[PDB]
Amino acid sequence: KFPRVKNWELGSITYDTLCAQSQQDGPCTPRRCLGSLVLPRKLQTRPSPGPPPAEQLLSQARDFINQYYSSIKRSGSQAHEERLQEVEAEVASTGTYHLRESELVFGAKQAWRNAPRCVGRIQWGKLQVFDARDCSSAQEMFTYICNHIKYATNRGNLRSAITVFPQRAPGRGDFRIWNSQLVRYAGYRQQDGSVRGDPANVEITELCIQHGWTPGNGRFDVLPLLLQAPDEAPELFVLPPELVLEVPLEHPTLEWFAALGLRWYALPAVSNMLLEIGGLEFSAAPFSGWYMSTEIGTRNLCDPHRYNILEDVAVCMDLDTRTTSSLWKDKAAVEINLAVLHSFQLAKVTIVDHHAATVSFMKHLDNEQKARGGCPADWAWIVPPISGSLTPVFHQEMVNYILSPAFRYQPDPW
Amino acid sequence: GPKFPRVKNWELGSITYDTLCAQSQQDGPCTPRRCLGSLVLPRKLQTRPSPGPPPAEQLLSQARDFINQYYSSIKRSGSQAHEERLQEVEAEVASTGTYHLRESELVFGAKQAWRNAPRCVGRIQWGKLQVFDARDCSSAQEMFTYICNHIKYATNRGNLRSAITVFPQRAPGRGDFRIWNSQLVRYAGYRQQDGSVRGDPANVEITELCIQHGWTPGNGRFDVLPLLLQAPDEAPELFVLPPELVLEVPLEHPTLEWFAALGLRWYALPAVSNMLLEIGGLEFSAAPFSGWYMSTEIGTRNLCDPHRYNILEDVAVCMDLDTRTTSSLWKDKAAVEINLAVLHSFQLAKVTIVDHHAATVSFMKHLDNEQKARGGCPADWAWIVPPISGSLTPVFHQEMVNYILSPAFRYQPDPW
Numbered sequence: 001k002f003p004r005v006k007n008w009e010l011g012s013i014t015y016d017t018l019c020a021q022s023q024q025d026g027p028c029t030p031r032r033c034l035g036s037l038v039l040p041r042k043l044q045t046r047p048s049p050g051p052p053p054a055e056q057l058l059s060q061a062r063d064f065i066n067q068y069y070s071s072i073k074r075s076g077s078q079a080h081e082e083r084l085q086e087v088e089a090e091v092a093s094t095g096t097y098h099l100r101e102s103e104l105v106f107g108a109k110q111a112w113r114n115a116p117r118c119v120g121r122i123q124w125g126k127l128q129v130f131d132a133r134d135c136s137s138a139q140e141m142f143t144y145i146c147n148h149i150k151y152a153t154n155r156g157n158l159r160s161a162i163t164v165f166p167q168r169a170p171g172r173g174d175f176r177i178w179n180s181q182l183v184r185y186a187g188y189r190q191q192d193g194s195v196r197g198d199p200a201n202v203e204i205t206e207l208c209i210q211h212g213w214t215p216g217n218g219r220f221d222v223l224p225l226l227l228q229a230p231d232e233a234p235e236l237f238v239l240p241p242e243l244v245l246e247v248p249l250e251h252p253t254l255e256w257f258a259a260l261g262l263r264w265y266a267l268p269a270v271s272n273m274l275l276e277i278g279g280l281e282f283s284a285a286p287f288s289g290w291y292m293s294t295e296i297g298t299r300n301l302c303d304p305h306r307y308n309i310l311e312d313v314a315v316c317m318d319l320d321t322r323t324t325s326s327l328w329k330d331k332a333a334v335e336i337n338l339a340v341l342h343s344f345q346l347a348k349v350t351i352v353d354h355h356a357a358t359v360s361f362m363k364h365l366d367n368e369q370k371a372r373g374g375c376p377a378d379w380a381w382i383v384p385p386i387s388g389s390l391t392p393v394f395h396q397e398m399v400n401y402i403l404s405p406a407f408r409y410q411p412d413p414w
Numbered sequence: 415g416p417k418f419p420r421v422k423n424w425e426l427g428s429i430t431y432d433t434l435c436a437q438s439q440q441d442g443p444c445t446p447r448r449c450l451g452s453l454v455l456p457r458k459l460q461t462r463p464s465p466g467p468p469p470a471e472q473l474l475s476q477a478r479d480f481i482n483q484y485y486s487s488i489k490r491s492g493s494q495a496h497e498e499r500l501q502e503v504e505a506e507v508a509s510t511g512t513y514h515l516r517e518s519e520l521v522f523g524a525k526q527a528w529r530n531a532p533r534c535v536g537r538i539q540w541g542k543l544q545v546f547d548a549r550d551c552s553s554a555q556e557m558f559t560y561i562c563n564h565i566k567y568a569t570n571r572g573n574l575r576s577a578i579t580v581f582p583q584r585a586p587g588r589g590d591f592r593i594w595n596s597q598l599v600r601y602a603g604y605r606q607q608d609g610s611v612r613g614d615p616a617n618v619e620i621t622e623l624c625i626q627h628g629w630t631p632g633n634g635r636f637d638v639l640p641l642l643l644q645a646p647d648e649a650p651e652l653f654v655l656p657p658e659l660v661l662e663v664p665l666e667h668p669t670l671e672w673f674a675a676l677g678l679r680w681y682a683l684p685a686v687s688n689m690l691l692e693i694g695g696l697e698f699s700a701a702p703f704s705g706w707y708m709s710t711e712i713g714t715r716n717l718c719d720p721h722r723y724n725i726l727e728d729v730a731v732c733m734d735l736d737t738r739t740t741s742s743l744w745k746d747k748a749a750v751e752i753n754l755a756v757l758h759s760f761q762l763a764k765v766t767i768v769d770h771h772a773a774t775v776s777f778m779k780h781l782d783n784e785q786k787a788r789g790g791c792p793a794d795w796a797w798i799v800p801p802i803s804g805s806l807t808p809v810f811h812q813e814m815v816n817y818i819l820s821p822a823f824r825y826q827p828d829p830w
């Protein structure tokens with residue numbers, strides 16, 4: 001019934017009783033495990049042209065409201081009962097309801113806390129929540145986003161934040177941020193099918209040009225935002241350069257590294273995920289924190305389908321790229337990650353290396369074991385892309401399941 | 415689209431569908447409610463010592479399935495020979511409660527068990543396996559003879575060859591044939607007075623057991639342990655492998671001249687000996703198998719794990735790195751040089767070994783061969799992706815479906 005979770009480095013064991021609280025199904029079954037799949041096959045988020053079953057929504061809303069009053073130690077109180085009646089009354093008459101700002105803040109922090117793929121959850125309690133539900137146009141969306149960015153960047157002393165735009169509504173279009181992140185580098189397809197810039201942003205880069213953007217021709221051209229108000233074509237907005245903090249990359253001892261002209265933005269702000277609280281869905285709720293160095297140094301810069309700079313760096317390090325056994329890729333990867341850490345640290349911009357991050361996550365696991373009797377975690381995403389076993393989480397067994405409030409993937413708006 | 419798991423490779427953007435999972439007849443530890451795919455030992459395949467004979471009804475369905483697999487493999491499914499073998503197996507089980515495999519069936523089954531192993535990245539070599547039939551073995555002493563021959567053949571003075579020796583299957587009522595050691599070659603772990611361990615911390619229990627059985631312990635960091643071999647219904651017997659038969663490689667670094675002074679070393683032959691081989695319901699409690707090493711097993715796991723030799727700090731200090739701060743990536747730097755030393759040394763000693771890049775690339779080829787040959791390949795992502803440089807290898811970006819197919823290698827409880 002309850003999974004026996006073991007840590008192989010310390011020989012310690014714990015039981016996850018929290019997983020019993022899961023109400024949403026994952027992709028696995030006794031016949032086969034599909035935990036390595038990035039996106040769901042069916043756990044997607046189908047349209048909302050029609051109102052969701054009142055009974056279903058109501059049970060989800062009740063659970064959430066129950067969670068909320070439990071957090072403020074007022075479960076069973078008069079306020080708790082009166083709130084349930086309000087939600088009850090509104091759903092029965094309108095088919096939906098609305099959250100009080102206090103509940104929204106609690107819900108956003110809980111969704112982060114429940115995110116199985118995030119290694120930085122020790123920070124879950126520290127999140128600035130901007131209520132943008134009073135937004136009625138793409139222009140206003142742009143203003144909220146600029147304020148979010150300014151606040152979150154804080155001149156290099158990054159502060160986690162989330163801005164919540166209006167919830168989805170039946171038979172009405174969704175408020176959406178087309179870009180997958182608030183700050184992305186353009187990806188331009190060139191003559192021979194190759195790509196200049198970030199190969200992962202080719203499609204979005206094209207949509208931007210398609211919608212009137214005058215494209216650049218560099219390797220790190222910050223993309224403009226395509227923001228969409230309900231049932232309207234997306235509108236193009238260019239982010240004020242002074243709002244986009246970037247860090248020039250250089251190496252602590254390799255004088256030539258800087259000559260590579262590499263750089264990366266300071267703010268990691270996912271903008272394409274859906275936030276679900278008490279059955280309510282927020283199709284546009286950009287969130288941000290700070291980077292873990294491997295995200296930039298290993299994945300963004302070294303992935304084969306990304307900037308793929310491994311060989312360039314290897315050649316500059318005069319390594320033997322003639323064979324795999326020389327481990328030239330491993331050596332280059334380490335120096336690139338070192339350059340990222342050194343540079344962000346030099347530019348006084350918040351960043352965390354994969355060792356510090358995993359160590360804090362182990363602490364989080366312990367805190368959660370005491371607080372809730374478990375912690376949903378997705379091993380493949382918690383263990384860093386390099387030096388996996390050199391970190392504590394590698395040797396820690398984990399249980400993965402879905403708790404709500406939650407952040408979920410949703411279909412591309414186009 | 416197709417009603418089977420959709421598997422994607424995020425590097426190539428290609429998609430495939432796994433239809434082979436449809437053939438699994440054994441459940442794993444996951445459910446729609448939660449994924450337990452990271453658990454090393456989930457009480458699923460766990461072949462607990464089942465004293466009372468197995469349900470003749472359950473044994474037969476498993477046996478029939480295996481025979482169908484075997485006849486399918488030789489392209490004679492539905493033939494008269496197929497139906498006759500099926501009748502022979504059912505008859506044998508009827509009058510004895512069990513049955514026996516023909517020589518070729520055992521060979522086929524051993525290879526399929528390796529082929530079906532979700533956690534093995536070396537499966538592109540699956541078709542090349544020397545299967546030693548030792549089902550005539552009747553004593554612990556004879557087990558030692560078979561094991562020594564296996565070691566000699568497999569080691570082949572450095573030009574390693576994959577092999578498996580199969581001892582008698584579990585029999586109703588009679589005790590099991592067992593090799594107490596988890597591997598044929600292991601280094602002793604000696605508990606110290608201060609509580610620390612000299613040697614391999616992973617082998618403290620087995621080391622103590624060997625001592626308790628008359629072994630006179632050494633006091634080194636790399637003392638090869640003796641074998642505790644157990645024949646049916648007899649206490650385990652102790653056997654010391656002749657040094658000349660255990661090929662080892664002293665570790666040195668290609669450029670860091672001082673690394674050789676560390677006195678580190680590792681043995682050439684990775685031979686797992688505590689796993690159970692299951693074929694058509696029959697259980698081979700003693701069926702040690704071996705291939706060759708993938709460098710990270712030695713350089714990253716065995717030498718750098720916190721609970722193993724834990725040499726990361728020593729090497730970093732030798733490289734004069736800043737071990738007082740994580741952002742210096744001293745752990746990452748030292749791990750890289752330790753792995754390079756392993757590859758370098760094995761290559762120098764002319765002992766077969768494969769680096770994690772070459773291995774994962776060959777596994778990708780294996781996945782493609784298997785997609786065409788069986789419509790899928792059971793794979794455990796966490797075990798397939800190397801412990802270092804994960805995303806620098808192609809397997810990291812490949813989604814994988816994990817499920818249990820039989821014949822298979824399963825975990826079994828310790829004999830003691």
Ligand code: HEM
Nearest residue numbers: 112115117118119120123160162287288289290291292407
């Ligand atoms: C403050 C420091 C933070 C750090 C260092 C951190 C780090 C990470 C990392 C490394 C990943 C995996 C990235 C990948 O492989 O693509 C991740 C995923 C995630 N993080 Fe965090 N995180 C932080 C803040 C946040 C915040 C503030 C939120 C939300 C309020 C959040 C929500 C998530 C979610 C939902 C995922 C999984 C997304 C997916 O499934 O694609 N994180 N985080």
Ligand code: HEM
Nearest residue numbers: 528531533534535536539576577703704705706707708823
């Ligand atoms: C040809 C060379 C081979 C290589 C390079 C290779 C490599 C590996 C590696 C790296 C692992 C995971 C090690 C760990 O994390 O503990 C593994 C696991 C495994 N391999 Fe292979 N392997 C090879 C040959 C074999 C052979 C010949 C067999 C059997 C006939 C085999 C059966 C397995 C099994 C069953 C496991 C999983 C055991 C467990 O769950 O602990 N391998 N292999």
Ligand SMILES: [Zn+2]
Nearest residue numbers: 028033444449
């Ligand atoms: Zn699973």
